[PDB]
């Protein structure tokens, strides 16, 4: 059972090194969409003042 | 060409070690 447990405990670590490699992708893929909302909002910086 | 009885026609008519070798180790 201990021969299972540590053998399982490394495999969990194999998914943690997976999971951040997903998470650090979302932190990329959000930003351009946020960038796609700055370039519209700096429109209104003109237009309302018009 | 004589017919035969019906009750005589009705009368004549490596995947093991692949788990054990992995269960001994872990």
Please check whether residue A4 is in contact with residue B26, taking contact to mean a CB–CB distance below 8 angstroms. Answer: yes
**Whole-angstrom distance between the N-terminal and C-terminal Cα of chain B?**
69
Question: CB under 8 Å to A4, separation ≥6 — which residues?
Answer: B26
CB-CB contact of A3 with B26 (8 Å) = yes
- H or E element in which residue B2 lies: none
Task: Tell me how close the Cα of B19 comes to any Cα of chain A, in angstroms.
Answer: 15
Interface residues from chain A to B (CB-CB < 8 Å): 3-4, 7
- Total residues found in chain A within this entry: 50
**Deposited experimental method:** cryo-EM
Helical H runs in chain A? 2-47
> CB neighbours of B17 closer than 8 A, spacing ≥ 6?
none
- Closest chain B residue to A4, measured at CA: B26
């Amino acid at each position: 059972l201990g021969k299972v447990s540590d053998k399982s405990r490394e495999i969990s670590e194999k998914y943690i090194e997976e999971s951040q490699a997903i998470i650090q992708e979302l932190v990329k893929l959000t930003m351009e969409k946020l960038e796609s909302k700055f370039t519209k909002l700096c429109d209104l910086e003109t237009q309302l003042e018009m | 060409s004589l017919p035969i009885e019906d009750n005589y026609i009705r009368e004549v008519v490596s995947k093991l070690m692949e788990c054990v070798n992995d269960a001994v180790q872990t």
